Amino acid sequence: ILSTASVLAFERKLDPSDALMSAGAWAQRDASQEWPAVTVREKSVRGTISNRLKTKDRDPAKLDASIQSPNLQTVDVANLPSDADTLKVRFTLRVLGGAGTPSACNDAAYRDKLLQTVATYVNDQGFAELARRYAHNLANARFLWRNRVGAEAVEVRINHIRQGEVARAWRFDALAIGLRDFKADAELDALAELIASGLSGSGHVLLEVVAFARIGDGQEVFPSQELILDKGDKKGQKSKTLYSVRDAAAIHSQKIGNALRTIDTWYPDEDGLGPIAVEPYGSVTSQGKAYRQPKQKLDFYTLLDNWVLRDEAPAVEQQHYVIANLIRGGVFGEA
Amino acid sequence: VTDPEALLLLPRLSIQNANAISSPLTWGFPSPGAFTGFVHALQRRVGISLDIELDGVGIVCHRFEAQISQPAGKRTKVFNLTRNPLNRDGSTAAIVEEGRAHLEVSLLLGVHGDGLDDHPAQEIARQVQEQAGAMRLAGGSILPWCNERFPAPNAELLMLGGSDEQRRKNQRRLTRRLLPGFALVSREALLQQHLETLRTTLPEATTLDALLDLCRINFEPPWQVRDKPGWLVPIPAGYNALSPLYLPGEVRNARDRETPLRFVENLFGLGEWLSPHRVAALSDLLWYHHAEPDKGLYRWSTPRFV
RNA sequence: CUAAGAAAUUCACGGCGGGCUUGAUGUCCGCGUCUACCUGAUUCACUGCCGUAUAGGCAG
Structure with a gap:
């Protein structure tokens, strides 16, 4: 009957490291191994109430009384030095093999059928499109996020590390490569071939990704913010806390992974957003809305179940979406 | 339970986000069960092909760092969390607290078998190193040391030295290798x-x-x-x-x-x-x-x- | 076969108004630092000549 597995899990393929942030001057990007790190500092901010009022605080006397109480906060801030205009973001990326193999799965017939489905996908077209989109997300500085917004020029340098040295080196102009269009380029095709060979291999392929963004002299950079629950403590806390590994501002690994996963342009809604991160039930945290709802037949679980159990193979784009979810991983399976 | 014929020093392994929730009552460094399971997975993946046995692990913890913060006015500590993806209805899911920490460890693996004489020590040490370079140790990825000043090579030393003095010198030099820990x-x-x-x-x-x-x-x-x-x-x-x-x-x-x-x-x-x-x-x-x-x-x- | 497997914290912010720290003061008596050594190991790979020569020889 080929019942679906009660416990299903997939290992996270294509896992990056923390994006270390460092600062320097442009046209010295080559000798950037000794660039000083960007440090997270402390500063005091005094604001004023600017949020919406609930029709009972709109009395002028209460508003003036609440303004007369100073609103003080302590925030973590990260800045470029007052003589450095370039932010260097460096992280390491492992492209693991055994991409379609589940990490944990109950039913052995479901094992054979799922591995047969992945084998059909890989010998039909393989990871050609998926690794193309991942290499595009590497080539443009999507992992900088807000650091990519107002940069004069962004250059991404990607090096293949085989044993301890650069086997093959890439250099891209991130602002020329779009954040929503996946064209074809020769160096991009070479990077896609390397990533696809890593996904189809039995070991791993190591890449280091170094992006230089010309933010501005002494401007304010944006490391990943840390999620800390207040938990109803009586003392006032610092409102903003930035992430750092060793006295050096950094971006979270899952933030970089979410940036790399932004390849899904096949969701049923219109591509006004463009690509979105590959997730089950197509959730977008910034938009607060989950595309690929299960009421439509385009969510990951129903597509996978139709593909592997009832042999209802979806469209090629939906097959790419399902295999991209397999790259992403996750804990699956009903009770 | 057995005496290894050699010691396999896995070099400084940078572990990214290890499970800092070791037990229901303790936090901090990961459980030794994680390290023993990682060594058993190494034996299950590459140890059998090399006709050797990988049993026993030495944990040195060259560097530790847990993603924790201390709230103002409290002396205890809380764990920094991650923003999980939204539900299918667009609302924030229920937060399940997990502790994630940064490690830097080097492992002494006990090796005994016929593959030690069948293969060169440097070759099996290397192959174990690039086997472990694509694995997990306590729920976190392993950083493989690319384009730094110089990587730390793997070193396997046979415990059956030519003399007591040679064995003692080898033990002291291996101890000097994993010294800041x-x-x-x-x-x-x-x-x-x-x-x-x-x-x-x-x-x-x-x-x-x-x-x-x-x-x-x-x-x-x-x-x-x-x-x-x-x-x-x-x-x-x-x-x-x-x-x-x-x-x-x-x-x-x-x-x-x-x-x-x-x-x-x-x-x-x-x-x-x-x-x-x-x-x-x-x-x-x-x-x-x-x-x-x-x-x-x-x-x-x-x-x-x- | 690792309390296994999975994960975007994030948008915005005026901390400043002002101020006499001054009065007085004994650091101090005493003291054996000795003894004995090869800097020098080829430690000046130097000056000139024959030859276009960095190739290669020769002179004290």
């Missing part, structure tokens, strides 16, 4: 001795109270502090049986249907962090599995230490 050992005998001392101090005292007393900072009036022999962390010592051993197909929603499943619960023991110079041989730091499936007691420990 602290070896992790288990202190079950010390915990029992302290429990007997506590029982002579006052009766009906359980070993939980002895374990708590050996880790807390005690203040005594004339105001002094009761000194501790070492670092004396509380560590999970294994798993104890909580249910009769079920057949592989009895338990619904198991990991597989080929392995028996038994419900367990954590066993908490005593551990110590100490400098590697204070051990007679580096093979005394190796952590081994001790299952004994008849009575439960699915334990990991480091025997032959003292």
Whole structure:
């Protein structure tokens, strides 16, 4: 009957490291191994109430009384030095093999059928499109996020590390490569071939990704913010806390992974957003809305179940979406 | 349970986000069960192909860093979390708190078999290194040291030296390699001795109270502090049986249907962090599995230490 | 076969108004630092000549 597995899990393929942030001057990007790190500092901010009022605080006397109480906060801030205009973001990326193999799965017939489905996908077209989109997300500085917004020029340098040295080196102009269009380029095709060979291999392929963004002299950079629950403590806390590994501002690994996963342009809604991160039930945290709802037949679980159990193979784009979810991983399976 | 013919020093491994939730009652460094399971996975993946056996692990913790913060006005600590993806209806999911930490460790793997004579030591050490370079140690990825000043090579040393002086020099140089760190050992005998001392101090005292007393900072009036022999962390010592051993197909929603499943619960023991110079041989730091499936007691420990 | 497997914290912010720290003061008596050594190991790979020569020889 080929019942679906009660416990299903997939290992996270294509896992990056923390994006270390460092600062320097442009046209010295080559000798950037000794660039000083960007440090997270402390500063005091005094604001004023600017949020919406609930029709009972709109009395002028209460508003003036609440303004007369100073609103003080302590925030973590990260800045470029007052003589450095370039932010260097460096992280390491492992492209693991055994991409379609589940990490944990109950039913052995479901094992054979799922591995047969992945084998059909890989010998039909393989990871050609998926690794193309991942290499595009590497080539443009999507992992900088807000650091990519107002940069004069962004250059991404990607090096293949085989044993301890650069086997093959890439250099891209991130602002020329779009954040929503996946064209074809020769160096991009070479990077896609390397990533696809890593996904189809039995070991791993190591890449280091170094992006230089010309933010501005002494401007304010944006490391990943840390999620800390207040938990109803009586003392006032610092409102903003930035992430750092060793006295050096950094971006979270899952933030970089979410940036790399932004390849899904096949969701049923219109591509006004463009690509979105590959997730089950197509959730977008910034938009607060989950595309690929299960009421439509385009969510990951129903597509996978139709593909592997009832042999209802979806469209090629939906097959790419399902295999991209397999790259992403996750804990699956009903009770 | 056995004497290794050689020691395999996995070099400084940068572990990114390790599970800082070691046990239901302890936090911080990951459980030794994670390291023993990682070594067993190394044996299951590459150890069989090399005709060797990888049993025993030495944990040194060259660097530790947990993603924690201390709220203002509180002396305790909280764990920094991650923003999970939204639900299918666009709302924030319920937060499940997990602790994630940064490690830098080097592992001493006990090697015994015929592949040591069948293959060169550098070759098997290397192949184990690039096998471990695509794995996980405590739920976190392993950073493989690309484009730094110089990577640390893997080094396998046979314990059967040509002489006692040569063996002693090799042990001291291997200790010098993993110097900025602290070896992790288990202190079950010390915990029992302290429990007997506590029982002579006052009766009906359980070993939980002895374990708590050996880790807390005690203040005594004339105001002094009761000194501790070492670092004396509380560590999970294994798993104890909580249910009769079920057949592989009895338990619904198991990991597989080929392995028996038994419900367990954590066993908490005593551990110590100490400098590697204070051990007679580096093979005394190796952590081994001790299952004994008849009575439960699915334990990991480091025997032959003292 | 690792309390296994999975994860975007994030948008915005004026901390400043002002101020006499001054009064007085003994550091101090005493003291054995000795003894004994190869800097030098080829430690000046130097000056000139024949030859276009960095190729290669020769002179004290």
